[model samples]
Target: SECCFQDPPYPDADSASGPRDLRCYRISSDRYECSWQYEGPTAGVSHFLRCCLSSGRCCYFAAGSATRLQFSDQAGVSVLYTVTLWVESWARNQTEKSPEVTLQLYNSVKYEPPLGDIKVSKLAGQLRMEWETPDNQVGAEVQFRHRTPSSPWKLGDCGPQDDDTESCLCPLEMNVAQEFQLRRRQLGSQGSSWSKWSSPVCVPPENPPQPH
Candidate 1:
């Protein structure tokens, strides 16, 4: 069976004369659609579609010489994904044509866990650490570890639990000053993968004078 979808409407005409602007739409869960209303009537203009995935992390799909284009999941099953679109005039006279519109889509991961921002603070005789949640992540769990003044790193704790506030706190003795790191692990039918450690921050000793 075929799926029918609507394209986004083109914006009102621009005051200054120039090539037509473009319109884009999310259309459906994984589909993006785009089109343009040419300013001056002429033979339909030639255009191309190009897309980049996840803020340019993954490879882009270039249509080469097609006006309308669509990209499907290429790594087999649907994995976390995002895409941007650009249209350019193929005519030699319209070399100045620039990007028309852009769109994005997020997908699920099979095993890899997404990463988030980490925050650290010190209070009295203890150190606290917290972090934000990863994007498009399902059933994610956070774990942490630490290394103290020239000592080897050791696992500390895991999570405040799923759906908890995007933050957590860990108490540590002041005498045992150390640096800490945090990571997230995604758990689901596809299994899990640990995220890269967050930037390290040191826990301060107790009774230190505040910086003036």
Candidate 2:
């Protein structure tokens, strides 16, 4: 069939280059993202990303100028998926494609850092620290340092409490000040990469406060 004067041979040899170093990672149980680098000209160029089940049923597609794609629900764990990048040269009517990248996103899921203000108090020569856990987080790592900012960090781990908070106890030597920090991670069944530690919370020495 002939249409529009036999379709202009699609401008051969002017095809846009495919994406490079494509990488994808899970941001949360319900969200994930993919990013890539491009090595060639981008003027008047557009990118199309398609992800599908390994068996070939299409599941997601993204288009336009972004080199990154954020997906929710359509991307999941346990299932094998393949994502391909197609670069379109609008002026040349050319489309170039990259090798499909396989994804098993479960191994890459990362929980956000623990959230909420941290509270620390001293009781009976021990320090009690608590902070809020992000949604779906299973456990946390607590790091603490005593006396000064340059002190070595001591570590401890605790699972989320019933109220979705994390409470950890560390024994500090009598009459010393301390600083505490925390980071969160998913269960082993999920990806277990640790989130960044929260800002350190400083607590005063146990001696009674002096009048200002």
Residue-level lDDT of model 2, residues 131-150, one tens digit each, is 67667554544344334444
- In TM-score terms, candidate 1 sits at 0.40
Candidate 2 wrongly placed segments (more than 4 Å): 1-25, 28-31, 34-109, 136-147, 159-163, 208-212
lDDT of 1 by residue, 1-212 (tens): 11112221222222222334444433346654344433443354454443444444322223334444554444221234334444444443443244433332332232222244456676564566655555445456777777767678878666645653455456575655677777665554332334556766666666444678
**Top model by lDDT, which number?**
2
TM-scores of the models, in the given order? 0.40, 0.46
Model 1 regions more than 4 Å off: 1-117, 121-126, 207-212
Best by TM-score: 2
Residue 43, candidate 2: how far off, in angstroms?
A: 27
